[PDB]
């Protein structure tokens, strides 16, 4: 039975994403162009190309942000009611974007100028993946919460493979969160034992009894840029080598596969 | 003008690749199924989806192996004579597969059995990315030659971007070589100064005067599995963040892009 996959999908275009402004918590909608964009994406992957087979989708995880949720609706439009009824949708707060704090709605170069004026970054340039954001999340905070979601997804994958089913699980989220998610999925960054109060607690970030909570002994986080590109409405694919959930791997073809004979 | 890209393409199916046998120097052809498969891939990326625009392809680099070259022919079949005339094709020996030496045409598990019988791998399992192959290439050796090709390609990218043109450069090669190639492209592994006689010399691995040779001061190589999947006839995409050749990045969407408005 087909190796399980995690399909990452970045929210479609917003007014801020279009112009490079850091959109974290701000609950922006898709632009009219972004709606069209995500509609076309859904048609490409389901109808025109069959890069995804609905019969194989088991779970869709989404950030609680409007633009992620809108992206789920538009991308899944090509499905029949029957196909939809068999797919479970779960809103997971662990998949929200990096909390930018003071940097919300700013540009990269504005962030650099703001920090320089606070007297930081004297020895080396700011690097979100190492430093986090003043009044927002550190890298260990985002790494921790994405690890918990990854553990939940990989646990469903293992449960499904052992029930003899295919399992594509979709994750709709954001540009930083998803690059980060992909990075640790396949082993980037460092391993950190769960020890502090923050690191151990059940957070209760989603509400859906069919998704077992997995309590982490340890987690991964980044200390440097993993150097990924993922555009607004871009799609990436995470899976496993040799049908083995213990060998998570990055699919270099993203969602592309050669057309069947 | 569009950020330059390197489009990696793995040779289509062979009799050995279908069955997991390590195909290095052995000059196998595509199976009949593999031909069909690469023909359909070409139509998907140029005609049915336009994931690739021929007007933007400047160079195609290919391993000297028959199966890679055959893959070039079939994937580019949808192009007109006019489009082909403007694209330069370069055979580059630096893009050959990992030299397997003793392991040629063997299965992973056979290689493990063979090594265990020579009394190796007592402390930890064989890991090609660290250990290389008896009578074949070390990881340094492959990392060095792939680094030279990367430098040549990125130098053409920089020359083109500074001439104001788009540049998609395709690289047709092999499963280990391309995963390795992708891993170091975006900064995995370690930096090693060029110092030994091997590391410094001009090897003359291609013959095309329009490709400036770049003499490396230093190179990258892996010391561990980068955990990528890339199937036979799989397509990946390497590029740069912020239109900057000094920021090479992995495209998580491989060749997928949402259909234009
Ligand atoms: O804030 C966004 C994420 O949220 P969504 O737009 O996905 O909601 C993006 O990740 C970009 O604004 C961004 O900073 C890209 O930074 P880069 O790494 O290119 O220097
Ligand atoms: O020899 C091949 C490359 O040659 P082409 O078939 O691409 O020429 C492949 O790289 C396979 O042999 C292979 O071992 C996959 O290893 P894995 O990582 O799955 O454990």
From Swiss-Prot, chains A, B:
Enzyme class at the top of the EC tree:
hydrolase
Summarize the impact of residue 14 to A.
Impairs catalytic activity
- Effect of substituting residue 10 to A: Impairs catalytic activity
Give the catalytic activity. D-sedoheptulose 1,7-bisphosphate + H2O = D-sedoheptulose 7-phosphate + phosphate
EC number(s) for this protein? 3.1.3.37
Question: What is an example of a Pfam family matching this protein?
Answer: His_Phos_1
GO biological process annotation, one example: ribose phosphate biosynthetic process
Q: What is its main location?
A: cytoplasm
Expression triggers:
Expression is correlated with levels of ribosomal proteins, thus periodic SHB17 expression coincides with the peak demand for ribose phosphate that occurs during ribosome synthesis.
- Could you tell me one molecular function GO term of this UniProt entry? sedoheptulose-bisphosphatase activity
Q: Which domain of life is it from?
A: Eukaryota
An example Gene Ontology CC term for this record:
nucleus
Query: Keyword Cell wall biogenesis/degradation: yes or no?
Result: no
Which residues are recorded as binding substrate?
10, 22-23, 67, 97-100, 179, 242
Q: Where in the cell is it found?
A: Cytoplasm; Nucleus
Signal sequence interval, chain numbering = none
Q: Which InterPro entries match?
A: His_Pase_superF_clade-1, His_PPase_superfam, PGM_Phosphatase
Outcome reported for the amino acid change (mutating residue 129 to A): Leads to reduced substrate affinity
Keyword field: Carbohydrate metabolism, Cytoplasm, Hydrolase, Nucleus, Oxidoreductase
Site residues (Transition state stabilizer), renumbered to this chain: 174
Active-site residues from the entry = 11 (tele-phosphohistidine intermediate), 97 (proton donor/acceptor)
Quote the subunit structure annotation: Homodimer.
The UniProt entry's sequence similarity note says: Belongs to the phosphoglycerate mutase family. SHB17 subfamily.
Q: What does this protein do?
A: Sedoheptulose 1,7-bisphosphatase involved in riboneogenesis. Dephosphorylates sedoheptulose 1,7-bisphosphate (SBP), which is converted via the non-oxidative pentose phosphate pathway to ribose-5-phosphate. Has a fructose 1,6-bisphosphatase activity in vitro, but this is probably not biologically relevant, since deletion does not affect fructose 1,6-biphosphate (FBP) levels.
What protein name applies here? Sedoheptulose 1,7-bisphosphatase
Q: Which organism is it from?
A: Saccharomyces cerevisiae (strain ATCC 204508 / S288c) (Baker's yeast)
- Gene symbol here is SHB17
């Amino acid at each position: 039975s087909l190796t399980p996959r995690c399909i990452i999908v970045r929210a479609g275009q917003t007014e801020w994403s279009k112009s490079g402004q850091y959109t974290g918590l701000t609950d922006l909608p898709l632009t009219p162009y972004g709606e069209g964009q995500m509609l076309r994406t859904g048609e490409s992957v389901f109808r025109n190309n069959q890069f995804l087979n609905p019969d194989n989708i088991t779970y869709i995880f989404t950030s609680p942000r409007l633009r992620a949720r809108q992206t789920v609706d538009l991308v899944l439009k090509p499905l029949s009611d029957e196909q939809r009824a068999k797919i479970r949708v779960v809103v997971d707060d662990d998949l929200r974007e990096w909390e930018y704090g003071d940097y919300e709605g700013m540009l990269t170069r504005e962030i650099i100028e703001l920090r320089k004026s606070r007297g930081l970054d004297k020895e080396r340039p700011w690097n979100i993946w190492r430093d986090g954001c003043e009044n927002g999340e550190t890298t260990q905070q985002i790494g921790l919460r994405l690890s918990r979601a990854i553990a939940r997804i990989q646990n469903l994958h293992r449960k499904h493979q052992s029930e003899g089913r295919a399992s594509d699980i979709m994750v709709f989220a954001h540009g930083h969160a998803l690059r980060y998610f992909a990075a640790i999925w396949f082993g980037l960054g460092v391993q950190k034992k769960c020890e502090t109060i923050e690191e151990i607690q059940n957070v209760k970030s989603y509400d859906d009894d069919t998704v077992p909570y997995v309590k982490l002994e340890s987690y991964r986080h980044l200390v440097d840029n993993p150097c990924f590109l993922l555009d607004a409405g871009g799609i990436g694919v995470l899976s496993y080598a040799h049908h083995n959930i213990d060998e998570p791997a990055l699919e270099l073809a993203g969602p592309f596969v050669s057309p069947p004979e």
